[PDB]
Structure formats: structure tokens, C-alpha cells
Design a protein around this ligand. Structure first.
Ligand SMILES: [Zn+2]
Ligand SMILES: [Zn+2]
Length: 209
């Protein structure tokens, strides 16, 4: 009940989660806005919200166009609230030499909520910093999928060398908050192929402790 959609030159994975009523939740629309918008329209899906795992430039480049086209709210953790509009904070200037920004701040700011309901989609919310200070992971129990951004990938873990990066915090997020989830849970991460909690527990070389 979701699609992984790599977008932009970085090929960061956006996700569209949907239901049988053709309503949808968008995660991390990072680039190539027109490819994402036209796909949603071809599929006759009605998006309800944009949920951001974090505000690095490669996850936000299509936010303006998607937000404007569909008149939907943007959710982001308060610790990164300044990052959307500031290219000196979100990595674009430093990592690519060009500024990437939104034109408006997020209209919903997350803090310590453990649950979030978007229409009839309910998520458990975990604050999972280490790759970035406002990184959050959205667990959708109904279809056993975790939209965890750049914390945990297939065969690797998030880089901890960017603004506010902290490897000691990232490993705690992984061991204490992500890996206790059910082993069949799909890890729908920001970069690379899908995986599951169980597969990474057994085979991710950065997770032998
Ligand atoms: Zn990132
Ligand atoms: Zn990323």
C-alpha cells in the first residue's frame, strides 16, 4: 500500500502511502516535483499531508510545489524548523554549491508526540536523531512499514558528519528505538533499496555491537 519513488539527482526516496479510498500521505518529496505530482494525479490519489523525516535539502526540494499544488500541510520536527528556508542549514549550499529552500515554514511542528493521525492513517512517531537533530521515524503498524529517513539503510547507516550529526546518538536511536520494532517491518529509508528490521539485525555490518 505504498510506493517508493526516488527523486532528483540524489535519488532520495520519497514515499507515497495510500489506502483503498485513494487518499495518500507523502513522505520526503525531495526533488523532481513534476514527476511526483503528475504520478499522484495520474493515479487519482488525493494527498492529505507531507510528513518530513528531516529537512536536509535532498528530502525537501519538491515540498513547495507539492504543498502548493495540493493545499496540504507540512509536518517537521521543531529542531529543524529553521532548516526549510535556510540553505546554510539544510546542507544545500555546503554539499552542492547551490541553495535549495522552501518559501514557507512547516505548518505543523513535531516535538515529543508518540502518535500522529492523518485522516485514517495512524502512525507511531519516534524521535530518531544522530543523522540530524530533528530526524523522526513514522511507524505505520497497519502495513508494517517504518518511514525512518536516513537513520538505517540496507547494509549501512546514516552519515553522522553533517550539521548536528552524532554517531553515538545515531547508534542509540537504532538499537533503542528502531530495532525493537517487529522484525517483519519494512525499513523504508531515504536512500537505496527497501529492507526489513530483521534483515538488518542479522546482516547490517554496522550493527554488530
Ligand atoms: Zn539526510
Ligand atoms: Zn537523505
Amino acid at each position: 500500500m505504498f510506493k517508493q519513488i526516488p527523486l532528483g539527482p540524489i535519488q532520495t526516496n520519497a514515499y507515497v502511502l495510500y489506502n483503498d479510498d485513494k487518499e495518500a500521505v507523502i513522505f520526503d518529496p525531495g526533488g523532481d516535483a513534476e514527476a511526483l505530482i503528475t504520478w499522484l494525479k495520474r493515479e487519482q490519489l488525493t494527498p492529505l499531508a507531507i510528513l518530513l523525516t528531516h529537512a536536509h535539502f535532498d528530502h525537501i526540494g519538491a515540498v513547495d510545489a507539492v504543498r502548493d499544488t495540493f493545499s496540504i500541510p507540512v509536518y517537521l520536527h521543531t529542531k529543524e524548523r529553521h532548516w526549510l528556508e535556510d540553505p546554510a542549514l539544510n546542507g544545500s549550499s555546503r554539499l552542492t554549491g547551490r541553495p535549495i529552500t522552501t518559501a514557507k515554514p512547516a505548518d505543523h511542528l513535531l516535538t515529543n508526540e508518540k502518535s500522529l493521525t492523518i485522516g485514517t492513517f495512524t502512525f507511531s512517531v519516534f524521535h530518531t536523531p544522530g543523522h540530524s537533530p530533528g530526524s523522526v521515524s513514522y511507524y505505520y503498524q497497519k502495513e508494517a512499514v517504518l518511514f525512518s529517513g536516513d537513520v538505517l539503510f540496507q547494509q549501512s547507516i546514516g552519515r553522522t558528519d553533517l550539521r548536528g550529526g552524532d554517531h553515538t546518538l545515531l547508534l542509540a536511536s537504532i538499537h533503542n528505538k528502531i530495532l525493537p520494532l517487529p522484525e517483519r517491518t519494512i525499513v523504508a529509508s531515504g536512500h537505496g533499496p527497501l529492507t526489513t528490521i530483521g534483515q538488518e539485525m542479522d546482516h547490517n555490518p554496522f550493527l554488530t555491537g
